[model samples]
Target: SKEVAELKKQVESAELKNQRLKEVFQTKIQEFRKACYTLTGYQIDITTENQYRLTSLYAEHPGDCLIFKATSGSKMQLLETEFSHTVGELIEVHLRRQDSIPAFLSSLTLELFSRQT
Candidate 1:
């Protein structure tokens, strides 16, 4: 028979860690964005992982859609975070370099938008 109690205990611990990680992510990203804004008036933004997939390309709700983001102050930059490690490194590496945060984000946007992928 399957060991029900051990599996259940593992699941419970995993869920608890997941919840705390979510809390840390939400709080930290917001603070990171705010602090960067203080360094320079640039409106820095960080979008959460879209988790877009192969079908996400050339689709809206998964259909062809032209993506045009309106921006008053615009340049291009990208921190295309594809892994959890990328996310963790980001928290420590750049934000601590407050001198570069604004300028850093200014250079960060995925090479192209989706729906036209």
Candidate 2:
């Protein structure tokens, strides 16, 4: 009974840690959005879907669009932009083209946020 009780406590603690980590990550995402808006007048909007996916389009170029989808656990698949595009650059593009999708664009980061259950 004593061991079982201790194990339960450990499990509870782990769950609490998980929740805290999730909150921290979400906060980080918000901070990121704020920074992006301030720097490039762009805002990041989260989409409602079962899986993680991000689509960005340039306002000036409606045909050019970039979509990032989680391809696997911890791995991201980029569709359009080059691999050299930093996170900041991607955010900039997302903001500048928030209205119209850009042409000749593809995907971006996908693997990192892909659901794996």
Candidate 3:
């Protein structure tokens, strides 16, 4: 009876250690992303292995985000987003015509920021 209690306590301690390690790992990733945003002007987060969600530093609202999916051979597919429809012309010209995802995102970010200020 008492022996079983000791085993239960050991298992609880192991689980605590596991959870603490995960928290530390999460904190490190957040710090890295913060540095990325500082340099890139956009916060990039992985939604899936091939999907990415980007948030501009100039976002007026938290829901202002852009999602992209990776296609074969370095191509990117822009997913429909809340603000994407509003900038459909940019997507058609910048992404569809020029195939420049970075340029599109940079322009979009600047455009969104300007609308506010």
Candidate 4:
């Protein structure tokens, strides 16, 4: 009877440790995601090799977004999106301003929010 109780106690302790570790892992993942959001202001998804689709946090509709393909010399190439038609001017400005993807994404988010509200 005593030996059986000791085995049960050890099993429960291991189970508790596993649960705690899982909780910590989930928290770290959320923190990392929030950090990305803070910097980029967009949810990034890798659809394929060297291709990323970005959806603005201020998006009125979920589908309003753009996908870009990473090109040579770290340049970004527009793939396709309905959003390209609406934000064509800003897109051109970024291109003219020297292929600044981060600046374009940041300002685009601001412009989207401004129009939505």
Among all candidates shown, the one with the greatest TM-score: 3
The residue-by-residue lDDT of candidate 2 on 38-93, one tens digit each, is 65433445444322333332233333333444454444344444332434454456
Q: What ranking of all candidate models by lDDT puts the best one first?
A: 3, 4, 2, 1
lDDT minimum window of 10 residues, candidate 3: 68-77
Clashing pairs in 3: none
Candidate closer to the true structure by lDDT (higher is better), 2 or 3: 3
Q: Note the clash tally of each candidate.
A: 8, 16, 0, 0
Estimate the overall C-alpha local distance difference test score of candidate 4: 0.82
Order of models, best TM-score first: 3, 4, 1, 2
- Over the stretch 18-75, how does candidate 4's per-residue lDDT look in tens digits? 9999999999988887788777788777676788888888888768888889875377
- Expressed as tens digits, the lDDT of each residue in 1-117 for candidate 1 is 378988998999999999999999999989886775555333333333422211112122423221212243353223333432233444345444543543333322221232144
Q: In order, what lDDT does every prediction score?
A: 0.42, 0.47, 0.86, 0.82
Expressed as tens digits, the lDDT of each residue in 1-117 for candidate 3 is 998999999999999999999999999999999999998788999876688898888887769888888885377788898867778888988998998988898787778778787
| lDDT, model 1 | 0.42
Q: Of the pair 1 and 4, which is ahead by TM-score?
A: 4
Off by over 4 Å in 3: 1-26
Name the 10 consecutive residues with the lowest summed lDDT in model 1. Answer: 50-59
